[PDB]
């Protein structure tokens, strides 16, 4: 329409992404429900740590969504062996993730696809939640959801046990998994199946009991597991200070109610303490 079409960025299941003059354009059922989901939610959201939908248009049953052009994502940062992730860098990434998530959760929307590659960074080091193709409003009792959301490695145990209803805990668990990947530079819980995912969670964090998770056995795909002791968090995260271990502990609470919210996470001493989060312009670039 008014877009130069410069460079190819990537392809997906539902859409293909191109750089255009600078913006990113993502090109009998009718218009794609994943495209409509992205349009309908991002039109109602305006926050510095949420990807901006600048414009939408197309022809027939094909639409082009226009977004801010993002330079990289956390996955590229994490996987880049050259760049060192200092505690200040980790805090900064987590802060922006949580500020975006606090805003999103305030507007009764779950992302449901949090992972380093859906945390896009611009040239100014502003992190934005992107890919709202699985994002969904929450806090309605009538609305029934699917448990297969969140890529397996970042999926919370309540999802892996078939939680139909859930809340911000599905994002916060993925935020813990991202934090764990920022600290280790490798996926925390790389499960090859829904059963291998639950195994790795319980072998690392301990098999939860009815004390730690009151109604775990009421979840429809609950399977009774071997009781593991779980590796103490200080043994996993050797370089993590006590404030960061308290954050990690709260993101990885088995009980999704007890699991810390974005606002609670943001109020934790980890974010208040020294050192302060790295300013956007000083964050590492691949």
């Amino acid at each position: 329409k008014r877009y130069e079409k410069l460079d190819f960025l990537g392809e997906g299941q539902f859409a293909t992404v191109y750089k255009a003059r600078i913006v990113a354009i993502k090109k009998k059922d009718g218009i794609n429900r994943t495209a409509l989901r992205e349009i309908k939610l991002l039109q109602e959201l305006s926050h510095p740590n949420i990807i901006g939908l600048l414009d939408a248009f197309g022809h027939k049953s094909n639409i082009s969504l226009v977004f801010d052009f993002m330079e990289t994502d956390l996955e590229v940062i994490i996987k880049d062996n050259s760049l060192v992730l200092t505690p200040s860098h980790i805090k900064a990434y987590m802060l922006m993730t949580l500020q975006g998530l606090e805003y999103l959760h305030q507007h009764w929307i779950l992302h449901r696809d949090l992972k380093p590659n859906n945390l896009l960074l611009d040239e100014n080091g502003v992190l934005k939640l992107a890919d709202f193709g699985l994002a969904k409003s929450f806090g309605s009792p009538n609305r029934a959801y699917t448990h297969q959301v969140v890529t397996r490695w970042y999926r919370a145990p309540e999802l892996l046990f078939g939680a139909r209803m859930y809340g911000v805990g599905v994002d916060m668990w993925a935020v813990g998994c991202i934090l764990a990947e920022l600290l280790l530079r490798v996926p925390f819980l790389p499960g090859d199946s829904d059963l291998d995912q639950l195994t790795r969670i319980f072998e690392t964090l301990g098999t939860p009991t009815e004390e730690q998770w009151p109604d775990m056995c009421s979840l429809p795909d609950y399977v009774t597991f071997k009781s593991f002791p779980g590796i103490p968090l200080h043994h996993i995260f050797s370089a993590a200070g006590d404030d960061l271990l308290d954050l990690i502990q709260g993101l990885f609470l088995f009980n999704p109610c007890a699991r810390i919210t974005a606002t609670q996470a943001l109020k934790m001493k980890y974010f208040s303490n020294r050192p302060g989060p790295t300013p956007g312009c000083q964050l590492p670039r691949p």
């Binding site: 009998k28 218009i31 409509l36 039109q43 027939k60 305030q106 969904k136």
Partner: protein
């Protein structure tokens, strides 16, 4: 949320006069295209308005009998899409029979009410060929509808606000002993309000509260203390006056609402068909 929504920003208008101007502009902008291409075949804005009221009623009928059961949220969204579409478009350019189905189709996707295309057009009382033709027309106009909505798809309905006030009245307003006795009449008034331009002129919260206080006034219950004491408008007396005037204005829209007459609709339908025969 309504308070930072596209609905509030872009689709809540200052007055009926401002609506009538958008609709008048639509009617004369089509006339100027039709004359530029090529008589009393053209519909006047008041006739367009009668047909839109008639088709909005046909959209509600469609959504009411739709299997599987369409949530009220989807129906509200579809009806809002229909109203918004015909602010800036003539029924002489885009047939409201097609646009109303395309409204329902888009609303089902936006409100995450998962139905397949065939089970959607399965709800039409037409031959299999007719249903397949209907589907092709809906798919043709789905992008048109989204364009004319300016890609503002989330609609804030008064129904959740209505639930929030009932929780609040049950919790903080024991003077109203059982607030659930207001539900039926307040719902009846919400339906009537929906037939007007109210959805384009007031907030969903204002609409919901108007329905509740109207239902209270019919019951004989003088619950102005809820506004002053519970909602804390005794502090801000101008905010109270402003709120009472919105609700009076909204009660006045419903009183002066004329439904389309059968004999009038028949004549304008024939006139509408004649406009689409030639284009």
């Amino acid at each position: 949320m309504y308070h930072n929504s596209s609905q509030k920003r872009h689709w809540t208008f200052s007055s009926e006069e401002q609506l009538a101007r958008l609709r008048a502009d639509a009617n004369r902008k089509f006339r100027c295209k039709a004359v530029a291409n090529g008589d009393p075949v053209f519909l006047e804005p008041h006739e367009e308005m009668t047909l839109c009221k008639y088709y909005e009623k046909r959209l509600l009928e469609f959504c009411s009998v739709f299997k599987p059961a369409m949530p009220r949220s989807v129906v509200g969204t579809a009806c809002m899409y229909f109203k918004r579409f015909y602010l800036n478009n003539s029924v002489m350019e885009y047939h409201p029979r097609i646009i109303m189905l395309t409204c329902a189709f888009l609303a089902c996707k936006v409100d995450e009410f998962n139905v397949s295309s065939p089970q959607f057009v399965g709800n039409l009382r037409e031959s299999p060929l007719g249903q397949e033709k209907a589907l092709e027309q809906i798919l043709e106009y789905e992008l048109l509808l989204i364009q004319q909505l300016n890609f503002h798809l989330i609609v804030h309905n008064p129904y959740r606000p209505f639930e929030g006030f009932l929780i609040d009245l049950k919790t903080r307003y024991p003077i109203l002993e059982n607030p659930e006795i207001l539900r039926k009449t307040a719902d009846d008034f919400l339906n009537r309000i929906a037939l007007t331009d109210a959805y384009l002129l007031y907030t969903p919260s204002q609409i919901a509260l108007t329905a509740i206080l109207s239902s209270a006034s019919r019951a004989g219950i003088t619950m102005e203390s809820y506004l002053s004491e519970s909602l804390m408008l005794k502090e801000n007396r101008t905010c109270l006056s402003q709120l009472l005037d919105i609700m009076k204005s909204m009660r006045n829209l419903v009183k002066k609402y004329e439904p389309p007459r059968s004999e009038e609709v028949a004549v304008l339908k024939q006139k509408l068909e004649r406009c689409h025969s030639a284009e």
